[PDB]
Design a protein around this nucleic acid. Structure first.
Lengths: 83, 108, 96, 100, 99, 87, 108, 95
DNA sequence: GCTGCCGGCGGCTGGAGAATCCCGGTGCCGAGGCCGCTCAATTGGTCGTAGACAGCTCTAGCACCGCTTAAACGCACGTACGCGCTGTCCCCCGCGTTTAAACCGCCAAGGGGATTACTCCCTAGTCTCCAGGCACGTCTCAGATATATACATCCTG
DNA sequence: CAGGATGTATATATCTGAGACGTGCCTGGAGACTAGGGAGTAATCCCCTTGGCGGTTTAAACGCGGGGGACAGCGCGTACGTGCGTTTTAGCGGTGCTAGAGCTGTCTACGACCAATTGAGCGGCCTGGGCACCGGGATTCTCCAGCCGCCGGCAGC
């Protein structure tokens, strides 16, 4: 059993723990796919900008400074990696 | 003659000269004043001092000596005006404030 | 052994040493504090540069930073921040 | 004798208490890193990610999803429910100004 | 004897009439007085040009139309047609305005 | 009798029909009777937030009049960019 | 002699020279390159051309020749990729787009 | 005296270039002028921050190109980059 | 009437897992002395943004009556709201298990990064003349009235 | 369950006229003709941290089974929002009329700028010793289901 998509790697218990930190009590069984969709969309929206920043800097490595920049651009500032 | 730093004359521990030079290379304006670096350094020092005091309060409330990002996030979210200042900022290794809606709680 | 960088390490540590003399700060929290200082500095400086270019001026003085602080920091932070900014500017001007 | 089993929806509260107090991430590092690398493989081929960049992206997305789930909880409770449903997430995002 | 219109149908005609048009829905003198009174405690002896009152009026109407769109979304989500202050509060809370 | 004619109870000038029209443009059929005060409070806090920035802009400019340039500046500052006024 | 303007040589109907001067005097960077104003003016001209053609289509549908802010809102919001650009902006006398939830309609 | 600048002439030429028999109102002209001024500043500030990010003291067509990619969503992005490249290559072809 | 009887009622008690505390041992590593360099502070002089004064002057605010139409008041009325009962069937929650994350060790190497010679592109200095801005000045063709028909309702049989 | 009468909307012929669009006039700012000198740019080497590999091992994800409780739906009370007739009240306006703040032009002056010297703030690099961490066991912390005395109906008379 080795053939698996990396989108499914966001396991159902991981979503459950994330929602527990969010503060929810009972979760419907169709949350576990909508949350994957939201996660994928959010990851594209940030890694697209991260990729663009790396291309502009003529680098091939996606820097943590770059991810911070793309996040602050998106309206979600990150603390812990420079600034 | 003998020289001395700017912050000694301005009564600060936040770098007036560094802020001046940062405003200078930051392309913000063609010219910057001599008191604007000092005012900005004072505002930065005030905000940092208040944040650090609030975070140290939580750290000592957890019977710890060294400030941790969890305590600092607690201090940021637990003061309404600072939460407003840092509303769209997310703190890595900060977690979330413990808050449970009263509906989810049991009947008794 | 080369390419030294710059940060607000000593300044934030010194601010801690005057407010909680027996409390230290971890590395991750300290880097987060550094990012906070950089973010707020860029915010206020951007607002003040906006004001300076925005009233057809070219010099950023304590009035621009004052209006940016009154314009960014909400509520009581604005009052204490402007109060300490003016006291710092007057302390600078008094002793040459 | 008889066995001990908790009242359904109490360990949910216990996990809410534990995770709202904890600090570490709630998604395994390797699968999330694989997802990030796969989803950047479309934008550019042969991309390298710093060790810190991946975890920056990680806890950024974890905070995003925690905030979304909190808003979803509020929306569901506003709908006089306890179960969070896909339509709750859709409404939370739409009001937040994300889906539309 | 006389013809009477069912409730909600006139509200629907009015929903279609006020959405197609773009003319301003808050009277100018009451809003100008509101703006001047709100600006009193900020700085006394202030002068407001009709262009600034224009801008404030348009901004406020746009903001309130957006808030009522979100509030209608909340009310329909909760299987209601009527909008209540709880919907307005939830729309404001998810937006992050009152958070 | 030259100036300083302070008025009061003018937030009631945002009448119930005005809020109903604004709602119907927003897209609602049925209306509560108790949402009018909440909506008036919401408008008051929004206007206070915008007007604070508008007034502090003028005070920085050392002017005694508030322009639509100033209102637009304040609106764009808080993330509510407004077009049609010399932006 | 034989003075010739920049917009003509660049094949642009937008002020490349004015954009260059405004970048120079806008405190964006210490120095501004030569192709940057051309690229920026081209992008601005494309964006305004797209919005203007959509607004003209809206006006022609409305059986109207001139363009009013209502048509500009109608063109901006009806196109999703423009709406994403102008999501956090509002235009004076723009109105909104007529839409009603299917819940609000009667049975038949 | 006291001349003021705007984008009215260029927006009018753009209109005549897409609809040579369709006019504009005075309010929509200010609306378009404000949109142009807003997008111009939005792209220029992003390019400035891009240059500051890499310790570059210059703004070039590459910085504005990257800013266009960041700002304009998708189809807008790959049309706008193409048009900017076309205009810059026509500019550099004949100096 | 009044005996039994029958089901609930909540009040309480201890067995049940969870959580916490502290002693005991253990590292790991934030906080401190050292070197020197690199840049920040000092003179010395400039020259040019920005303050003042002096006007002009358009313009925001006040009053004042006539209109009229929207705002406020009432009044049947039926429709949405809220609640209560019900019947599920579908989330939770332990248990066995199957496994895949996580560490730990050793390498090769593409990629990031500091120096160097340089060259050649954006800046700086003047002249010039044409494109943008504005005061008109129109005659418009863009708009707004009042008219006349089709329409979508809500009742009847 | 199909027609008829109705308050709504639709088109359309004049009015009818504020104002987008030339038309010049003017002017100021962008382009054309000269160095120039530092900002980026290949070329080079020099690390480095990154991705890859292969044993354990071990907690976590997973599939199954039971349950009960949250949820959706249907019937019922109800009262409040809604649509419409009746004042009435204040926006809207159009008339002048008033000074007030905006706005521009000049002289001046002082403070931000910048260059050559010189000293120390601090960023780094070890380093000894000090705080966060883990173990097991004793100590509590809640949480749940059965025993029981009490209570209120329930068949008879």
């Amino acid at each position: 059993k080795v053939l698996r998509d990396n989108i499914q790697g966001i396991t159902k218990p991981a979503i459950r723990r994330l929602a527990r930190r969010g503060g929810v009590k009972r979760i419907s069984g169709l949350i576990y796919e909508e949350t994957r969709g939201v996660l994928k969309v959010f990851l594209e929206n940030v890694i697209r900008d991260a990729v663009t920043y790396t291309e502009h800097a003529k680098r091939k490595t996606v820097t943590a400074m770059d991810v911070v920049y793309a996040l602050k651009r998106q309206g979600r500032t990150l603390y812990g990696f420079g600034g | 003659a003998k020289a001395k730093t700017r912050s000694s004359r301005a009564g600060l521990q936040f770098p007036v000269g560094r802020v001046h030079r940062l405003l200078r290379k930051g392309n913000y304006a063609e010219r910057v004043g001599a008191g604007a670096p000092v005012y900005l350094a004072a505002v930065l020092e005030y905000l940092t001092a208040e944040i650090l005091e609030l975070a140290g309060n939580a750290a000592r409330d957890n019977k710890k000596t060294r400030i941790i990002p969890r305590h600092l996030q607690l201090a940021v979210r637990n003061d309404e005006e600072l939460n407003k200042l840092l509303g769209r900022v997310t703190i890595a290794q900060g977690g979330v404030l413990p808050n449970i809606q009263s509906v989810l709680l049991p009947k008794c | 052994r080369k390419t030294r960088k710059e940060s607000y390490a000593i300044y934030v540590y010194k601010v801690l040493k005057q407010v909680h003399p027996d409390t230290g700060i971890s590395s991750k929290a300290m880097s987060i504090m550094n990012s906070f200082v950089n973010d707020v500095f860029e915010r206020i400086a951007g607002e003040a540069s906006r004001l300076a270019h925005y009233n057809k001026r070219s010099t950023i003085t304590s009035r621009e930073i004052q209006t940016a602080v009154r314009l960014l920091l909400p509520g009581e932070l604005a009052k204490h921040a402007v109060s300490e900014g003016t006291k710092a500017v007057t302390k600078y001007t008094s002793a040459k | 004798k008889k066995p001990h089993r908790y009242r359904p929806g109490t360990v949910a509260l216990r996990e809410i208490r534990r995770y709202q107090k904890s600090t570490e991430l709630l998604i395994r590092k390797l699968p999330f890193q694989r997802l990030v690398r796969e989803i950047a493989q479309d934008f550019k081929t042969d991309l390298r990610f710093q060790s810190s960049a991946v975890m920056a992206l990680q806890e950024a997305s974890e905070a995003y999803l925690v905030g979304l789930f909190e808003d979803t909880n509020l929306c569901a409770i506003h709908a006089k429910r306890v179960t969070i449903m896909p339509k709750d997430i859709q409404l939370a995002r739409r009001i937040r100004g994300e889906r539309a």
